[PDB]
Amino acid sequence: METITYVFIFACIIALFFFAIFFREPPRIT
Amino acid sequence: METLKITVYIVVTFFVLLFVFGFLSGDPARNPKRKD
Amino acid sequence: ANLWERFCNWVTSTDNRLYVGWFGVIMIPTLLAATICFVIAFIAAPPVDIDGIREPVSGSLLYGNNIITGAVVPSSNAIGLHFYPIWEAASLDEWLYNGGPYQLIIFHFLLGASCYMGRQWELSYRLGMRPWICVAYSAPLASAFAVFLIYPIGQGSFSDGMPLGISGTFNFMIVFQAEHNILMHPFHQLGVAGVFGGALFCAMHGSLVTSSLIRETTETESANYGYKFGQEEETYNIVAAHGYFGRLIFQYASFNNSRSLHFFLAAWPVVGVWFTALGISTMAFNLNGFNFNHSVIDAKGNVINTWADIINRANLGMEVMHERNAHNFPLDLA
Amino acid sequence: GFAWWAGNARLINLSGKLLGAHVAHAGLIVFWAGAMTLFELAHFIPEKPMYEQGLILIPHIATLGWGVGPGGEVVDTFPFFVVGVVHLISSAVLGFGGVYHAIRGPETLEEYSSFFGYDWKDKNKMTTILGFHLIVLGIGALLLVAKAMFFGGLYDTWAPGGGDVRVITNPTLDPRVIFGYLLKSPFGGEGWIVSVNNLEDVVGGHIWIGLICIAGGIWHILTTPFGWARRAFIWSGEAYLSYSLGALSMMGFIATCFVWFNNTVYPSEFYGPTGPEASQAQAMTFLIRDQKLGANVGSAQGPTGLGKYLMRSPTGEIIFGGETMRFWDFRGPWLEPLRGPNGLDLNKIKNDIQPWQERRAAEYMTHAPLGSLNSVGGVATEINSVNFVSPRSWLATSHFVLAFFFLVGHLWHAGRARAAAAGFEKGIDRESEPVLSMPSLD
Amino acid sequence: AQLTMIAMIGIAGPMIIFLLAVRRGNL
Amino acid sequence: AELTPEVLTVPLNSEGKTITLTEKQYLEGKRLFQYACASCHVGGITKTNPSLDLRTETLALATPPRDNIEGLVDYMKNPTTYDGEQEIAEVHPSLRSADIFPKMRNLTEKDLVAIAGHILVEPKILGDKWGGGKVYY
Amino acid sequence: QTLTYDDIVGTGLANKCPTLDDTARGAYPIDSSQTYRIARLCLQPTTFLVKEEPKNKRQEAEFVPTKLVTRETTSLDQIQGELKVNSDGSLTFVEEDGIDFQPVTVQMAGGERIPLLFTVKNLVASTQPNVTSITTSTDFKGEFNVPSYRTANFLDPKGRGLASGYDSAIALPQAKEEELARANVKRFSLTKGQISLNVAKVDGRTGEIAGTFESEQLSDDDMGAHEPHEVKIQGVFYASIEPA
Amino acid sequence: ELVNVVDEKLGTAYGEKIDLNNTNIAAFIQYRGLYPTLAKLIVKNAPYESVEDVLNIPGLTERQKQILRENLEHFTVTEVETALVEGGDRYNNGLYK
Amino acid sequence: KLPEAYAIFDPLVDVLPVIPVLFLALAFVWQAAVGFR
Numbered sequence A: 001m002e003t004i005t006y007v008f009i010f011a012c013i014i015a016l017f018f019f020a021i022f023f024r025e026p027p028r029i030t
Numbered sequence B: 001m002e003t004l005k006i007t008v009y010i011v012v013t014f015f016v017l018l019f020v021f022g023f024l025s026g027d028p029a030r031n032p033k034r035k036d
Numbered sequence C: 001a002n003l004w005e006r007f008c009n010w011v012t013s014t015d016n017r018l019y020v021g022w023f024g025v026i027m028i029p030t031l032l033a034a035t036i037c038f039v040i041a042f043i044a045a046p047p048v049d050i051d052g053i054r055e056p057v058s059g060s061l062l063y064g065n066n067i068i069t070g071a072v073v074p075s076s077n078a079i080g081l082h083f084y085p086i087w088e089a090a091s092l093d094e095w096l097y098n099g100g101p102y103q104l105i106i107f108h109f110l111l112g113a114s115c116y117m118g119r120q121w122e123l124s125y126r127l128g129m130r131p132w133i134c135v136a137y138s139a140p141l142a143s144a145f146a147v148f149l150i151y152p153i154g155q156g157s158f159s160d161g162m163p164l165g166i167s168g169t170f171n172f173m174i175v176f177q178a179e180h181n182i183l184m185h186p187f188h189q190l191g192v193a194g195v196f197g198g199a200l201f202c203a204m205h206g207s208l209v210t211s212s213l214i215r216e217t218t219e220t221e222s223a224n225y226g227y228k229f230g231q232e233e234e235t236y237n238i239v240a241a242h243g244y245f246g247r248l249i250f251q252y253a254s255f256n257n258s259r260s261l262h263f264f265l266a267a268w269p270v271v272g273v274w275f276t277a278l279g280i281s282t283m284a285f286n287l288n289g290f291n292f293n294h295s296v297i298d299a300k301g302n303v304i305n306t307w308a309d310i311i312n313r314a315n316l317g318m319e320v321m322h323e324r325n326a327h328n329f330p331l332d333l334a
Numbered sequence D: 001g002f003a004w005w006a007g008n009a010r011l012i013n014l015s016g017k018l019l020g021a022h023v024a025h026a027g028l029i030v031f032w033a034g035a036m037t038l039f040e041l042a043h044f045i046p047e048k049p050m051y052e053q054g055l056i057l058i059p060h061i062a063t064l065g066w067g068v069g070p071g072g073e074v075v076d077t078f079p080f081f082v083v084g085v086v087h088l089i090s091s092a093v094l095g096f097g098g099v100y101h102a103i104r105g106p107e108t109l110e111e112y113s114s115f116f117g118y119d120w121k122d123k124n125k126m127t128t129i130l131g132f133h134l135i136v137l138g139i140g141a142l143l144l145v146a147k148a149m150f151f152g153g154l155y156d157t158w159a160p161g162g163g164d165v166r167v168i169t170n171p172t173l174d175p176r177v178i179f180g181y182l183l184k185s186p187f188g189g190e191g192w193i194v195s196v197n198n199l200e201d202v203v204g205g206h207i208w209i210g211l212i213c214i215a216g217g218i219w220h221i222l223t224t225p226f227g228w229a230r231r232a233f234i235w236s237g238e239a240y241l242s243y244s245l246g247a248l249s250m251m252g253f254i255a256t257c258f259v260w261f262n263n264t265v266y267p268s269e270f271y272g273p274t275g276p277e278a279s280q281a282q283a284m285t286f287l288i289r290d291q292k293l294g295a296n297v298g299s300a301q302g303p304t305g306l307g308k309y310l311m312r313s314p315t316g317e318i319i320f321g322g323e324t325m326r327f328w329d330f331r332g333p334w335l336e337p338l339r340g341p342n343g344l345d346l347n348k349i350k351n352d353i354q355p356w357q358e359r360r361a362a363e364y365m366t367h368a369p370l371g372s373l374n375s376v377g378g379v380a381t382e383i384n385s386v387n388f389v390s391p392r393s394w395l396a397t398s399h400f401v402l403a404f405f406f407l408v409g410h411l412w413h414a415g416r417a418r419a420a421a422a423g424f425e426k427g428i429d430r431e432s433e434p435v436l437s438m439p440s441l442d
Numbered sequence E: 001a002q003l004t005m006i007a008m009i010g011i012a013g014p015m016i017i018f019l020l021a022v023r024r025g026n027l
Numbered sequence F: 001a002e003l004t005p006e007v008l009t010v011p012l013n014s015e016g017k018t019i020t021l022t023e024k025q026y027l028e029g030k031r032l033f034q035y036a037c038a039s040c041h042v043g044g045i046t047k048t049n050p051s052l053d054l055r056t057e058t059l060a061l062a063t064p065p066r067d068n069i070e071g072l073v074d075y076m077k078n079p080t081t082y083d084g085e086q087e088i089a090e091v092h093p094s095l096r097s098a099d100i101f102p103k104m105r106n107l108t109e110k111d112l113v114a115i116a117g118h119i120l121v122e123p124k125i126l127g128d129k130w131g132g133g134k135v136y137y
Numbered sequence G: 001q002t003l004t005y006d007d008i009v010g011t012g013l014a015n016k017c018p019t020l021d022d023t024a025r026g027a028y029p030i031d032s033s034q035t036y037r038i039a040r041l042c043l044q045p046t047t048f049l050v051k052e053e054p055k056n057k058r059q060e061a062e063f064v065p066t067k068l069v070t071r072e073t074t075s076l077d078q079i080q081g082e083l084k085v086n087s088d089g090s091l092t093f094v095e096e097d098g099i100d101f102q103p104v105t106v107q108m109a110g111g112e113r114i115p116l117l118f119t120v121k122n123l124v125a126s127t128q129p130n131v132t133s134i135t136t137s138t139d140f141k142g143e144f145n146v147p148s149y150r151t152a153n154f155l156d157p158k159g160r161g162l163a164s165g166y167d168s169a170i171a172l173p174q175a176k177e178e179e180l181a182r183a184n185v186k187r188f189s190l191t192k193g194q195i196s197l198n199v200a201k202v203d204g205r206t207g208e209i210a211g212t213f214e215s216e217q218l219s220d221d222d223m224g225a226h227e228p229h230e231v232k233i234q235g236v237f238y239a240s241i242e243p244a
Numbered sequence H: 001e002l003v004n005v006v007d008e009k010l011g012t013a014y015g016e017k018i019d020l021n022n023t024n025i026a027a028f029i030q031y032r033g034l035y036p037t038l039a040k041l042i043v044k045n046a047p048y049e050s051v052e053d054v055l056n057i058p059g060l061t062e063r064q065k066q067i068l069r070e071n072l073e074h075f076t077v078t079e080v081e082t083a084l085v086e087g088g089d090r091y092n093n094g095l096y097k
Numbered sequence I: 001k002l003p004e005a006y007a008i009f010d011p012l013v014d015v016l017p018v019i020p021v022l023f024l025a026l027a028f029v030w031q032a033a034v035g036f037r
């Protein structure tokens, strides 16, 4: 259960990477 | 294992040649100001 | 509109969400290979006989490790500096026992990281920037070369490279101090000053700019909304910051040229970390920290201990215990 | 445009002053070689091994065959004196021309003579200067061949009888051997060109290099760069500097490994033992000591189950045990007599170890290249007493540092040469910011 | 001693600068 | 504490005669020990054979006793194994073998006395440290 | 022709025993008034079989095959000893010295590593009576000693050992010690193994013989921490005989 | 039932004398005339049923038999302990300084 | 040691190798003299 937990948290961070890059709020000039 | 070795040799060669010919394809000209 | 020219235009396109580039052509496959092997090994690799003494060290989660103790373990001392790809092993089982994954990961990573540095130059050129951000990155990159490649080269074995793990890193550190007295080496002392000073100046610059933000919002909203992306005017008063900091010390100890200030912010930690990378890289060839063991003796010749001698006692303890089964002879020459 | 701290960049288009800077700098190089040699000689004591005395230039001269006899014994110190005096004297001539061209001579050369003047952008002229220097370099390599074959030879640590100076009559010309080195793996047991282990290959490689360089020099005097080359490079003085900085970097890294691993063109008699060598010698020493006490070192199982003294390499070769298992690729003249087809031969080990081999292993084990920055010899926990740092540690570390910084120098000047050539090394034009005319990523 | 030499050699450098600065030379 | 004549007083022979060194001789012998011996014998141990050290009690039990000036001067001329049974000049530095150990060539008879005196004085100053090895660093 | 080190190095030939031509079907005569020695005995394992545990009743598991993970480090070589003629004309080989052990670890199906000390230490091997000639039907049967895989200085990962180390689980200061006694007290096993050497080739002119071998012995017991496994080893051997 | 055989040996004469059957060879340096020649012979010709047996080693000169005879009270013999004599450990037991 | 005929210059020789360093320092004396222009 602890292996499952570590891997789960790690997988969530990778998924968060994906949204933070490809679904960021777009920077808009002035 | 031999198949693996050959496969990796081909794959690496492929990517290295892309790199070399890519930078030989007029790379200085690919900038936003002065192309020559 | 030739097919090769169309590929070339896509590789170097500034319209890709992530820039690819010619350096990226190498970087993307090598980083993916290193990443995929590392994740799999960290979770599931069997124990590795890092020291070549048929005493395997368990590094992965499924073999009884947690996040802090786990590691991808360095390759066997029996291999030394020999190249050990998968196709040199009689079986994957052999390759895993001997620590093959570590070699695959560090070689792919160092290549991909080197191309990462090149990619930073390359996009700067496509955007019409000045080119030297990649020079800043050469300091962490050189540090990675030192602990993954240079130190194993000088010591003769990737088994003495830094493990890919948290407790393994501390193991590497403790053993490094016992054998090189790195704390007493000036290039590490310069690295500490680059890292301490870098944290200091980061906090200084952040607090001085934050201190002098021009009032642009109400107390019910984040001050951050007083800046809009791409506005032409500066968002803080540097003369007010200069007036505060110059009085906090004295006038001429404070910057009023922002270019000079940001160059200073760039140079201090970069140069400090160059030196500490060079420290690892030269202790790889056993030019070690200062030795003042028994440097003070009295009129009769009694040793008068200093704090250096106390350091030596701690170093001796790390020496005699490390790799407790791997030494048959009195001197640990590598 | 340049501030005082970038002041030498003001020389870029002053070919006469830039010539003076280069030539004066050459005088500094030759000066150091002259003065350092004399300093080393003034401090030299023949009864002590060179590597107990902090010498790095005298060992280079001895390797060329001057001053030494059998075993590396110094027999005559006068060739050292001469090499140092002649270098020292010559630095005055180079200093003289250097400061003349930098202060008094014509500020730019291209008005004075079309031969000596140059434009960085003149690709024909630039490759002609390159070709001249290629020929000089090619001559340079043939001087070593000349010394080896016609003027007394070179020091040969592998020579039967302890090492000696030996004339090379059959340099290796077979290009399968010479270029085979260039294609060996740099990894353990292979070692790329660093594994060159005999003087015939060394001398043969230099014949090849001299011919190739001379041929290439004539090639570049006679031609101009082809179009593929013209579209692929930046053609400016800073670009050329950045190329050479990259080349020097690569060569410093190689030299680092050469002095760390190679005991052929860096004889251990002179430079001290290598890391691998000293580690092998310690196993040898205690094999000898224990076997004299009656130990059967072949059958002795150590704590781990591997042999206490002898074990197998991963490909089966009988090798020294303990942590030195990593150093089994080491080859040296004091150890090779014990090697049979399967590695170390247990019959030779039982019966044929000589006193000179016992002495040498004891000497090398106690002169392993470990020491502190203040020159206390040994592991970092050793007490003061022994004033010693191996010349190999000094030469490896110094040149790693230089090689690293010159790689950074290459990045600095390569990126700047690109930016300057495209016209944005001074920053972004506010009225024509490229990103502002690009579509957004989201 | 050895410090006699390095004093004479040391002063030589600044001496050139000084002579040129007093003679108002091409500095 | 200081280097008094009493500490500088060491046995000359097995018979019990003693000799009193000068400070100068002690310092001379320490310099010469570092030059010719310390690479193997730093701190009174023996790096290439740690079973045998330079502690006085060890030297006392060697055959030819070596805990005296004479015995040590003789050892530097004609070293033997610890039981006296074989001469080891060809693997151990000595005057008899200064052709193969060139650092021994320019050692005079008084240099030998100083080196011997250093070896005998030093355990009186350092105690267990001399020949004790890293445990006592 | 004989190869040099630089021909062999890195190939894996260093781990292989010399072989005889298939035409070497001669016989080596044994004169009892003479004494003989084995100048070189070489044993090259090719197969490692481990006996499984059948858990249930009288089932007796079989020998299953394993994968070697420690590479070309397995051969015993340069072994020598006396070759005696006994009063009944049987020959007895008495091992005296040589590289007569290799640590080996093989991997069973499922991932279990089995380390073992492949050895012929103290081998005494004897033939049938009335030999008078070593022929391509001559067999040697013998037994040998298998000492503990680790020797007495070896320290486990918590610092415990037999001739050195802690005597307790120092990281559990107030744990009940009775459950840990098997891991806390190291013991040194000394067991025996059996070997058959079957001569298949004989060069009657040179005194070289070669053939097949099979040994049975115990695996590592980790200094008493666990029960050993039974291992069967098969391979080829080479020997050279000389008049002593 | 589980006993450390090396600790148990320290409770016998092995713990106070040079055991001709077990002790590492460097212990023969404690008494004069024994190291290295006679120590080599003694170790190579172990084991011994009684301390007096060392005098029957073939090859001993009368001076060597004299040296042993003077030292017989510093010797003992106990049963061979496998853990102390395996590994070549009587010649090198991994202890230096 | 140097040959006997040159023994007189021994203290000079001990100092010569540091002279290239003095050229770097001389560059900063020069720049101090002209005001770092």
Ligand code: CLA
Pocket (backbone or CB within 6 Å): D003, D004, D005, D006, D007, D008, D009, D010, D011, D014, D017, D018, D020, D021, D022, D024, D025, D092, D095, D096, D099, D102, D103, E016, E017, E020, E026, E027, I024, I027, I028, I030, I031, I037
């Ligand atoms: C190897 C080091 C080196 C060399 C060879 C040079 C060489 C040069 N520099 Mg650079 N420079 C250097 C390091 C070096 N520099 C460093 C470290 C800095 C940073 C401070 C600078 C900063 C710098 C600036 C800011 C400028 C130069 C300029 C110049 C040129 C003209 C200088 C001049 O006229 O001064 C005149 C100086 C004098 C007349 C004073 C006396 C100097 C003499 C030569 C001292 C020599 C003494 C020596 C013992 C003589 C031996 C004689 C014997 C052989 C007979 C010249 C080619 C200038 C340039 O580019 O001009 C276009 C310029 O503006 N340099």
Ligand code: CLA
Pocket (backbone or CB within 6 Å): D019, D023, D093, D094, D096, D097, D098, D100, D101, D105, D106, D109, D116
């Ligand atoms: C690579 C270095 C280099 C280069 C490219 C130049 C180039 C030049 N120099 Mg300069 N010079 C140099 C080094 C250099 N010099 C040195 C070292 C000194 C001090 C001796 C001088 C002193 C000097 C003076 C005093 C004058 C020049 C002048 C000139 C110009 C005309 C020279 C001419 O026609 O000679 C024709 C060619 C010859 C006479 C060659 C004769 C044979 C030579 C000496 C053989 C070379 C030896 C060999 C190849 C290598 C050296 C051996 C060594 C390794 C042991 C020209 C631009 C003149 C000038 O600018 O006028 C205003 C001028 O007045 N030079």
Ligand code: CLA
Pocket (backbone or CB within 6 Å): D127, D130, D134, D182, D183, D212, D213, D214, D215, D216, D217, D219, D220, D223, D224, D225, D226, D229
């Ligand atoms: C200081 C040495 C030097 C320098 C700076 C140059 C510079 C130049 N040469 Mg010349 N050349 C030289 C020596 C040199 N040459 C010599 C000695 C010869 C005789 C063999 C030649 C023969 C030669 C020919 C035949 C040609 C040039 C050409 C050129 C130009 C383009 C070079 C290029 O694209 O390289 C970039 C390199 C490549 C595109 C291929 C690199 C392949 C190598 C082997 C990869 C290996 C690198 C590896 C990572 C490192 C390990 C080494 C490995 C071999 C083991 C350029 C002006 C070209 C030109 O325009 O001439 C008019 C041309 O066609 N050169």
Ligand code: CLA
Pocket (backbone or CB within 6 Å): D004, D005, D006, D007, D008, D009, D241, D245, D405, D406, D407, D408, D409, D410, D412, D413, D416, I021
């Ligand atoms: C053959 C080698 C070479 C050459 C000819 C040049 C030439 C040049 N460089 Mg490059 N450079 C090099 C190597 C080289 N560089 C390397 C290896 C690096 C990486 C460190 C750089 C990094 C670099 C930067 C960051 C910059 C240049 C710049 C320049 C230009 C101005 C240089 C100047 O006036 O400095 C004047 C000299 C000084 C101010 C003094 C430097 C003092 C050094 C750092 C101290 C060294 C002390 C040493 C460790 C010993 C300590 C002992 C103690 C007693 C002092 C000039 C075209 C400038 C440029 O872009 O112009 C176009 C610039 O900004 N260079």
Ligand code: HEC
Pocket (backbone or CB within 6 Å): D362, D363, D366, F033, F036, F037, F038, F039, F040, F041, F046, F048, F049, F052, F053, F054, F055, F058, F059, F062, F066, F075, F076, F080, F081, F082, F088, F092, F093, F115
């Ligand atoms: C390594 C190359 C050594 C050097 C240099 C010196 N000594 Fe040594 N010493 C060395 C060994 C391997 C041994 C044991 C020799 C043996 O097999 O018996 C010794 C022994 C001695 C002893 C006897 C110690 C004792 O009886 O307890 C003495 C007195 C001694 N060595 C002195 C000595 C001196 C004075 C040296 C400098 C001139 C010296 N040794 C150098 C190894 C090495």
Ligand SMILES: CC1=C(/C=C/C(C)=C/C=C/C(C)=C/C=C/C=C(C)/C=C/C=C(C)/C=C/C2=C(C)CCCC2(C)C)C(C)(C)CCC1
Pocket (backbone or CB within 6 Å): D020, D021, D024, D025, D027, D028, D031, D085, D088, D089, D091, D092, D094, D095, D096, D098, D099, D102, I006, I009, I012, I023, I024, I026, I027, I030
């Ligand atoms: C330009 C410039 C610069 C630079 C300069 C240079 C770098 C120069 C060089 C110079 C040089 C490089 C010089 C040289 C000199 C030398 C000499 C002058 C020599 C002499 C010698 C002698 C005299 C000797 C003697 C002897 C003998 C013979 C024998 C033995 C002994 C003796 C040693 C005594 C600077 C930076 C400053 C600044 C700016 C400008």
Ligand SMILES: CC1=C(/C=C/C(C)=C/C=C/C(C)=C/C=C/C=C(C)/C=C/C=C(C)/C=C/C2=C(C)CCCC2(C)C)C(C)(C)CCC1
Pocket (backbone or CB within 6 Å): B019, B020, B021, B023, B024, D177, D178, D179, D181, D182, D193, D196, D201, D202, D203, D204, D205, D206, D208, D209, D232
């Ligand atoms: C002497 C000797 C020898 C020999 C040697 C030789 C013979 C060598 C050769 C060498 C060589 C023959 C080398 C080569 C080199 C090469 C290189 C180094 C290359 C580079 C490249 C580059 C750099 C490129 C780049 C690029 C790209 C990639 C893309 C496009 C763009 C550009 C162009 C930029 C021997 C070892 C035997 C021994 C010892 C001695």
Ligand SMILES: CC1=C(/C=C/C(C)=C/C=C/C(C)=C/C=C/C=C(C)/C=C/C=C(C)/C=C/C2=C(C)CCCC2(C)C)C(C)(C)CCC1
Pocket (backbone or CB within 6 Å): E009, E010, E011, E012, E013, E014, I016, I019, I022, I023, I025, I026, I028, I029, I032
């Ligand atoms: C070989 C020989 C010779 C030659 C010599 C020469 C060549 C010399 C030169 C010399 C020189 C070349 C010198 C120089 C020096 C210099 C100096 C002495 C420097 C100093 C500096 C300083 C001290 C600095 C300061 C400062 C400033 C200015 C500013 C900033 C800050 C500071 C503080 C850093 C003769 C003739 C003798 C003869 C014999 C032999």
Ligand code: OEY
Pocket (backbone or CB within 6 Å): C051, C077, C155, C159, C160, C175, C179, C322, C323, C326, C332, C333, C334, D323
């Ligand atoms: O420090 Mn100590 O030294 Ca460099 O090796 Mn010898 O022992 Mn072991 O392999 Mn990892 O560690």
Ligand SMILES: [Cl-]
Pocket (backbone or CB within 6 Å): C171, C175, C321, C322, C323, C324
């Ligand atoms: Cl450890």
Ligand SMILES: [Cl-]
Pocket (backbone or CB within 6 Å): C326, C327, C328, C329, D321, D322, D323, D324
């Ligand atoms: Cl070891």
Ligand SMILES: [Fe+2]
Pocket (backbone or CB within 6 Å): C205, C209, C262
């Ligand atoms: Fe900022």
